[PDB]
Structure formats: structure tokens, C-alpha cells
Design a protein around this nucleic acid. Sequence first.
RNA 1: GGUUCGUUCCAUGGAAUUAACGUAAACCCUUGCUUUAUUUGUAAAUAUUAUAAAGCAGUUCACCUUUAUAUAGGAAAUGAU
Lengths: 112, 179, 438, 178, 46, 188, 177
Amino acid sequence: SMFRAKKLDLGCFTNVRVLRDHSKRKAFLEAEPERQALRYVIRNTTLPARTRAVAQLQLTQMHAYTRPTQIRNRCILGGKSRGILRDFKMTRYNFRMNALMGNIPGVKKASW
Amino acid sequence: DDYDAPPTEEEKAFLRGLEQGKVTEYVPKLTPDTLLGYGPPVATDAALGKVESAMRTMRILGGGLPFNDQSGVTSDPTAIKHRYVHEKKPVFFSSVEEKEWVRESLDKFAVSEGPEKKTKQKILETSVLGKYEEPKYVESLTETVKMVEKYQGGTFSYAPSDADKFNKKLNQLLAAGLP
Amino acid sequence: SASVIFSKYINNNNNKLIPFKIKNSDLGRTRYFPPISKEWKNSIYVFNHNNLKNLPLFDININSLIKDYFNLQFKDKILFKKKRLSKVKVVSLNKIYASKAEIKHTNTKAILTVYTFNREKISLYKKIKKLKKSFYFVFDKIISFSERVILSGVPVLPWITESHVNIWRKIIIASLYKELILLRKYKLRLDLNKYKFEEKLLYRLNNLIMKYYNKKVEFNIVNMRSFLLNSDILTKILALKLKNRNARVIKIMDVILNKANLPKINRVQEKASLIKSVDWNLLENKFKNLNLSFILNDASYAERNNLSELLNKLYYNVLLVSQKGVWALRSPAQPKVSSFAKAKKYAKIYQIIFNSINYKNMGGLRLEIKGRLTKRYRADRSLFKVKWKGGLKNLDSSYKGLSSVNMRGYAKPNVEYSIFTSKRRIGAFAVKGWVSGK
Amino acid sequence: EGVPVPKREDDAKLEFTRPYNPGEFLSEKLRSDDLQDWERERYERALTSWEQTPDDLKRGWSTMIRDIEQAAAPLRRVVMPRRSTFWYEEEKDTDLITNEDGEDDFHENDIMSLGHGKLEEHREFREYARIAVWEMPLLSKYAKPFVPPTSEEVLRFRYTTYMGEFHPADRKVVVEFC
Amino acid sequence: IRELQKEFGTLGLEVDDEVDDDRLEHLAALRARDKGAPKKKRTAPS
Amino acid sequence: EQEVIMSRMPRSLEALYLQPLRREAEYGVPSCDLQLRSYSIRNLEFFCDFALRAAYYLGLPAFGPVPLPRMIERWTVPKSHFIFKKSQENFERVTLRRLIQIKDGHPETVQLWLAFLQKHAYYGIGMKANVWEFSKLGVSKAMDESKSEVEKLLETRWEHLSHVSDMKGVGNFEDFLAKERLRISGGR
Amino acid sequence: RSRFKNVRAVEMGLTSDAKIESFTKKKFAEYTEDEKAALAHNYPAEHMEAIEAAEAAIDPKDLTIQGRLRVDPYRMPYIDDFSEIQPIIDKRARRSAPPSHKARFMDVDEFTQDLINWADEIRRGTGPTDGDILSYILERSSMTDNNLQANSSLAPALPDKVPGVEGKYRNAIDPAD
RNA sequence: GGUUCGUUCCAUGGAAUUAACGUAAACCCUUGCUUUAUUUGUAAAUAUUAUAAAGCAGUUCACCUUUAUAUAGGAAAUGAU
Ligand SMILES: [K+]
Ligand SMILES: [K+]
Ligand SMILES: [Mg+2]
Ligand SMILES: [Mg+2]
Ligand SMILES: [Mg+2]
């Protein structure tokens, strides 16, 4: 909740989980170097055993929004998360209807 | 009695000039200056390529808009005044005519005639001269800080600010794991 | 000497020489290549695909932004219109109808195309044109009658300052207030309709749309004469008509179809096929050896060496007066133009360009309405009406047998399909519309 | 706050409520209600000139404004919509209501949208043909001939450009020497 | 549209928000038949 | 006051109705590799001829257009937004591309060519050029000695940028460009 | 070695190099002093500098060894100098001045002054004519921009009778109804 | 009533004449051929794999059989292709 911006900054299809996944992408952008350091100290077997156990405990106290595995692409037209095409940021269905209308550049009905 | 006379031949001939258009002139003009700003920002030995990489660095500071010297001279003075006054960031004008249009359209709004000296040197240093910081070679592996700089300095993925967030946390862990 | 590495890129010279072969097989005429911007709304290719995944969404934001920009109108307090208070939502059709935008992207700018049907000018221009011509002739006399009296003594000048001109202007307004307002009421309403297509107001909209693509946007607004030559404009007019509770659905469709005139056609010749025969007039079959050496080396006719003479016998030259063999040029601030630009006659040029354009004439029309369109406020079954006039077929291929280029892999190049969704007080309904070109 | 209420406090107050003549107009202005002292002399001197005019000229002015009133008569007439009208069926703006006669007829002066795409495609061909005939020849005045590399030119650098695009791979420089 | 109304509102131009104007008209109809939303409670249930 | 019968039209106008002429390369060393791309062919096939003409006037011997293997991305999506999976349909996005290779061309003249194509670029086409140039050893010295030469050519171009004295919104100059170049390119 | 083939040059009899020159001087001869002067008298200076530079760039020896005819589907279907900008077949020209962001619509007071200033502008060559009142409703500005004739983005209109469209339609609705 | 892969085509009916959609045609891949282009693909090369833009091609010609004389069909590794 503390990561949810008090002023909406989304211009696409807004949703409960769309706004929740956008707040996770910004939290990780600010903590990637700091999170990449803890992951580097945990794997460096040359550092003291205490330095690795400390860096290992701090990485557990990080907020869930900071974890990059939480990020899941969603549809910018329907807010779904299942069947999203990375090249278009939409579900397989929305891609079809827009591809036939000509809204997606270059796409073409395949026949061969 | 409500009758509207059809358009006369004189009126029709007048509408054509507006809708269809008239026979205007066209003066061919092509010099390296008219092409300057569109060239390839390559770091070649030819000065033409280096002068284009220094202009590309001015467009990045000015907002990042392409070089368009053929699509008018208009702009948004309200947004250029805020960026120039309240944000204190540079502004890039594709032509002198676009600079004078922002002046005469804002009530007593003055812009600087070119950048400052310190800003001209910062541009030529990295974009043209390309003065870098050679990542030194680390022999021993136990040198954590010296080895991290080696990697951070050998990739444009880590920006000067990202390398700070990393080193801040790193130094905090190394110091917190000692007797 | 030369560098060693410079020689490592010279030995690798296995280039295949251009043979300049002669054609011994008859060639047919190429297909009709329809415009490229009509396949996808955005005619774009970017090497970094991060500038391409948001266009489908910006299309909706820009469309709603252009729709509201052409609907701009003065505040009733600016023209002294005396707004009649009515909470009811007005449904005005005499406005500018815009279609979905088509953008031509580059790495420098974007050209935005939108077909408009200006119905507000059809009424404003005629209304203001009713003002008798004497109004302007009589007004000119008040300017001379008032200068000989107010700006003069006993019944521009050096002893006439500007302070007196101010008082002299209010006297004319004091007597012609109720009249100058009427003229100003129609003058501004017409100019606003005129500036929407000019840079006086299009430069403000560009600043709004420039925030999406990050490039200066050039406009290519096309003016449509009839609202039936575009499905986007057609499906919206019919939609605004059906939104009224008392709208006669089946009747509003017939009045629109009745306005769609189809060209006279011979159903036999129209459906008759084409026999495959060599066209010896084509520039490819005329000269089977395109090399100027053989063509000009007195092949058949003598002293046609001049390349200009050869081209004049193949293309329609505009500079020539007689139309062949004569380019007599006169021999011994104003606009910089040639001394014969006015002599040039583009009479047959227009006939060549527009004859090389297919799908010009309207030859098909189909309207479909579906949804809740009843009159009473209750749960009732859906409704679906269909009306059509003409055919949506591609004649050049279905009958003549010529090869066509289908858009997006499946769609026909001559049909335009658009859908408009609205809602009554009882539910939603859609209006689908097709329009084909012969 | 609360349930929204309408905004009916919108109206433009007309300056003059009735047609004033130069005499009556100046009288109300010279009434000394709100005006500068030195400015009151200008209106005063103006009123003296008007009253000095003969009655015949004053009569002409009065009849002149009535001629303009009749000239603007057909412009403020409330046109009645046609019985079976199509565009003014529910138009509440009496200003745009016209006869509607011959407003939808086709004068054979326009092609379909699909045709306008092939027409604009020609205007672009001429724009390029105009450039290839008048601007291209000027490129030869600034061209330079190729000279083979000397013996000191041992390196061969490569720089990749995207022609006005920002691509992360436009920063690599490839060199190859023997 | 709000930023479009403010860009051209300085010239005396007006454009109706058919989207928001429709939302407000529907909410008014609900209150006419006593179907509107209740009063937002701002205290714990007690 | 006399009529002169012109024998022919200007060569600039006649050359517009002939196949684009090509200069002959003496050595045949590639100096540029322009790769054009688009989802259509009529704009790509046209601009290819327009580019070969500009290379002839600049004295650059061009080779092409070479049709490179078209790139085909395929997607198979269900026609329905729900259970009906037994019926799907195939989509694709074919990328048609060409290659114009220039040989024995002056480095600077190759840039005027690439500058001319970007100013008059055709809509719907992407471009990527690889420029090759020979140079001597000791590049560090060369790039420093060429500072005064570039400082003169920029004398009249500094008027483009303007900022308040001691711009504070930029902060760390090098970090600004790094994070602003990402915003301009959208992530990278 | 060359880039092309001489197979098409030996048939016409251009084996010798001297014989190739006789084919250019006789068929690709440059403009004479008279033609040059006569050609420079009709075109402006800027249009002539592009012709003098073309005849120097395109050498006649290339047109003889590789000069071919254009049969691609993008060639122009007619010959023309393309010197000027035509009304219909060319994109609308943009030769006007930029607008004024500080200018606003004219009120009742400013509207009259502009109308008066127009009565004097036309009364400087009775009263306004048809060509004057018509140029006042469509070409006179209504804003405080000093009568600016902005450059419009409206595509050029088509002829009053589009070839291929005219001569095929009959009005279904009769005005007498 | 015939014929056709086919409401295809022909003939005919003391009622027919026509329009739209599907169908057909056309389209994409593939096949032979012509021209174009030769890099990042090709040993060489006078151009022949590959790459890919456009154009041509079929049941076309030959042979056999054939109703109401109107519309056609057959033969399938030993006619051409
Ligand atoms: K090679
Ligand atoms: K092949
Ligand atoms: Mg309730
Ligand atoms: Mg029958
Ligand atoms: Mg089929």
C-alpha cells in the first residue's frame, strides 16, 4: 500500500491488479542495484561467513514488491495476465481483433 | 420567398484557388548545412561525424525530440518555460526561427544565447573526445571493492547513480561482517 | 604502397557482371498496387520495438482527442447567443465528422491523415451568404458620412489624433450594435470552422498529440463531399440518428441508401471476363532491349538519336506545346517560377492520374444494426435489421480475372469496414457499415 | 460539495439595450456618470458638431440605419425545417437550419477514401521526383573522391547508425587490423 | 480531454465530455428513483 | 526576343526516366552497408531506387538492392476469448528488407548520403547503416588534436541549446544522459 | 576489369574506344552556348544552378554503356519539369508565417475596427464588390493576428469533374419533388 | 431433358426478368520458366545453388469419341509439355 502512488500515473486500462503490478515495477527499479549487491555477496564464497549470513538476512527483509519475480506482464487493454504476448502487451484475443482491424502494424493473417 | 441563387461562375473560380490551390514557387536549396543535424552520429575521423554526435548530445539534453527543420517553428511555450525556469533543464531549438517564436509568444521570456562554457566542454569530452576511465586490472580475488569497480566500469548497464546504490549497500555489508 | 588489410578486401571480388540480357518472352502488365497506408493504420517500421507496442493504445487516445477537437465551439457568452437552459442532452448533427486517423511514421516526424465531412459549413456558408450585398455598400457610406461630420468641422488628416477616432468608432457601434453582433456571430462561427484545418489552431493540437509519439505531427485532413464515401463517417451519422428513442430504424436506413447513387453499368460487360492477350503498347514489350545503345542506334527510324525525342514518343510531355517535337523556349519581387509555367496545360495529366486510380466510384453499400432498439422501457428481445445497396465484390478479380492484392492477408482492397457502438436507455447497440469501390 | 447543482449564472450582458443615435448616445455619455474630465471635452466637442448638422443630414442617418436593418432581415429569419427533414430532425440550434435542398447530391467531384490513398501516393512521388531533378544534382558540388588508404592506415573501424533512432547497439565500435 | 479543454479554453472554446457527462447523468437518474449510493460511513461499525 | 529550339531536356530530368545509373568501383572495398526494412514492398522498392540515384551524383558506386531473407514471426491464437480452443488461426508479420552496399566511397561523402536519406526518408521504412573507415595508430592523440577543428564547426551550431546559468536540473551530467537516453528509447 | 558486359556494345559496332565517343557526341551532345543562355533566361538562378551541375555529374559515356529505359511500376507516367507546385496533383504549399500564440478572437470592439480597416483597404484603388465581400468572409482573419493568412493542412481538392467519375451518375432525387 | 467437380453450361416451360451473400474467381505458400539484383549467401566462373521483387504457364496443343447438332468428354510410365 505504501508503494501505491497517491496520484494515478497509468494511462492504459486501469485495474486493481494492473495498479498493483505497476507499483511493483517501480519498487524494483529503485532497489535493483541494492538487491543485486546482496545477491552478489551471498554467492561470493571469498567473503567471511558472517558477511554472507548478514547479506542473506537483509535480502529476506526486503519488501515483496522489491522482488522481481513478482512482476507479471498484463494486458494494457483488458488487464488480464493470462495469455499475454510480450511483443504487443495484450492478450491473444485482443491481438486478434486489433490485428484484423489493422491497429497492430505489420501483422498479417498467415496462410501457406 | 426563400430562394438561394446557385453559386456564380465568379464565385466558383474563387473557391478553386482556395480548395484546389494556386501555382506557388519552389526554390531548390541543398547545402551541407541544410543536411546538418540529420547526419549519422558516428565517431569517425571526419569532422562531419563528430559534429553530429555533439548535436545528438544536445537533443538528448533538450528533451530527446528528433531534428525536424521542415515541420514548422511552433512549440509549447508554456512547457518550454517551465522546463527552462522551474526545472532548470536545457532546451533544444531545431532552428533560430523556432527560438524567436517562443520569445515573441511569451510575455518577457528570455533565453540564453547558447550554452555555458562548462556545458560545451562536458559535451565534447565524452561525446567527441570520448575520455573514459580505464577499468584497472585486479589480480587478487579478495579485493571486493576493486573488483566491483572493474565490472561496473566495463558496461553501460550500470549508470553513475546505479553504481552508487550498489557500492553504498556493499560497503555496508563488508563493514558489518568484521570483528 | 597500400595497406595489407586494404588488399584483404580487394581479392574478395567475385561480383557477377550485369549481362543486359534481351527479353524473348512477352510480359504482362503489373497488378494494381493499392496504397500502403491502407493496410495498417500506422505505416511504420522501427528497429527498436519499444517504440511500437503502444501504438494500438495511442490510436484510441488520439482518436478521442481528434473527435473532441473538431467538436469545439464558442461559449454562448462570447457570441451573445442567450443559451436556452435545458438539462436535456442535445443531439446536433450539423458538425464536423472525422474518421479514424492514419499515421505515416518516420524517424523524424509523423503525418496524420483524417477524412472529414464538414456539415457545419454547408449551413453556415449559405446562411451568411443570404446577407444582402447592399449591407456592405451601405455600411461604406456610413464611414464617409461620419467622417464628413464627426471628423470634420463645418459641413486621415494631420490635425486628427487617435483619441478622437476612439469616440468616433463607438458612435457607429452604438447605432449598429444589434447588427454588428449578427454579422460577428456568423463570421466567428465560420472562421472557427476554417481554422480547425489551419495552423492557427492545429499547432495547439499538435502539442497534445506530440506528447504521445515524441515527434512533430503533420496533418493531412481531407475534405469529403458526401458522407457515404467513408464508412467511419457513415456509421457515426447513422448511430447518432438511432440514439433517439423515437427513431424509426428501418426508415433512417432507407433515407441514407437513397442518397447513395450508384453509377450506371452494363451487367453483361461488368461481369464479362478478360481474354489473356499480349499488350504490345506496354513499355516492356515495345522495347525488348532496354539499352539506349540499341534503341537509339538507328534500329528502325533514322535520326531519332536524341533521348528527348524517344521519351516524347512514349510519355505525355507537358512542356511541349504542339504535344510532340517542339520545345521552343523564348530567348533574348515576382515569384521565382519558369516563364512557361502558365502555358502548361494539365488537362490530360489529370486524366492520366485519376484513370490510374482504382476503387474511385462507389458501387456498394451495406448497413447492419443490432441490439436493443425498442421504444418501451422493459426487457425485450434484441433487434437486427439489414439493408444493402450494390455489391461489395472486387470486380477486377471476381469477373475480369485480374490478380488483386488483398490487404492484411485476407481483406479486400476495395471495401471499408467500420463499426460504431452506442447505447439507448435500455441497452447497447452497434452499427456496422461497409462501403466498396468499383 | 454534495449533489451537484446546475450552473445557470452564465449570461453575457449586452452593452446597448436599444439602438441609440449619435445625439442620444452622446447625451447619456456626457451625463457625467463615469468619465475623465479631459475626456468629457472630446465628447462635448463631438456633440456640438452633431447638433450643428442640418436636419436633412440627420434624417438621412436615421433612414440609413433602417436600410441596414432591412438588409440584415433575411439573415435573422428563423427558417422552418422541412417536413421530412434528415439533418434538422432534432436540431435545437435555429441558426444552422437551412432549406436542405440539394445538400446531399453528388456532383461527381470526389472519390472514395481508398482512392485518396493512391492519389496522395502520387503527390509524394512528385515530391521525390522534384527532389531528384532539382536538389540531387547539387549533391555533386560537395562530394569528394575516394582515395585508397596509405601504408599508415592499418586499422579499419566500424560504426553502426540507425538513422535517427535510439538503439542500444549503436554504441559498439568494431576494429580489425592485420 | 481535461487538458484539451484547458488548452483551448483560453480562446473561449468549449467541448462537452460525452463520457463524463454520461456518467453524471446516470448517477442523477439513480437518485431520482432512490437507487443512489448510501452515505459513506467514516467510522468503525459500532 | 527570339525562339531557340531546345535540342533536348536537361539531363537531370531525362535521367529520371532511366534506370538508376551506377558508378564503377576500382577496388571494391565496402564502405557502407545500408539495410532497409519495412512491412510492405512498394515503399521499400521505391526508396531503394531513390537512394541509388543520390549515390550516383555523390560519386559513390552502389551495389544493390540486394533482397535479404525476409523475417517471418508467427503467432497462433484462438479465435475465441474462451473455451473454444478446437478452432485457432495463424497470424504472421513478414519483414521485407533490402541491402545497398557502397564501395570505394569517401567517409565524409558517405555521411552526406546517409544524411540525405534521413531528411527525405519514406514513411514505413527502417534503416541501419554500418560505416567503415580506415585510420592510423595512436587514436587517442588523433581524437584530441581534432578538438579545435570540431570547435570551429560548432561555433554556429551552439545556438541550438540554451539553458539557465548553472543548470541545476541536470545534476550529474553523465548520469543525466544515461537515464535520459533510456526515457527517449523507452527502457533501452 | 569492368562492372558490366560488352556483349550489348559490340553488336552496334562500338568495339573501339574512339567509336564509343562518336556515339555520345552525336547523340548525347551537351547544350550549346545559345541553348544554355536561352535555357537560363526562362528558369530562375536557383533552378539553373541545378541544371549546370547535372550536366557535369551525369557524364554521357555512362548513358551509352549502361543507360537503360525505366520500366518499373514507380516511374512517372508523364514528363514534366516539376519546377513549380501545382494546385491539385501536388501537396499544398506552406509559404505563410507561423501563428501568434498570444492572439485571441476579436470582440465587438476589435471586430469593428478590423471591419473599418477593411473598408479603407478596399477603398484605396463604388464600395466593396463581389470579389471583395467574398474575400472578406473566407480570407479575412477574425483573430488579433494582423490579418494572417496561415498555411492550411487541408489536402488539395479534386477537379470539378473527376475523370473516370463524371458521366456515370444520374440524380435519383429530382429537385421538383 | 442433357451435361458439369459445381443452380456449371446448353435446350426448354400457357411467366418470367433480376440483385446481394456463400459458391466461383482472385489471394498466400509451393512447382517450371523469363527479367531484375550479387551481400552478410555462392569453389571457380562468361552465372549455375541460394536469396526475392515482378511477369508468363494447362488440360494449352496433338490424338480419339461425341446427343437435340445446342452445350462436350475421354485416354493417365512408352503424344508434346
Ligand atoms: K563477399
Ligand atoms: K533463382
Ligand atoms: Mg441504496
Ligand atoms: Mg429460366
Ligand atoms: Mg473461394
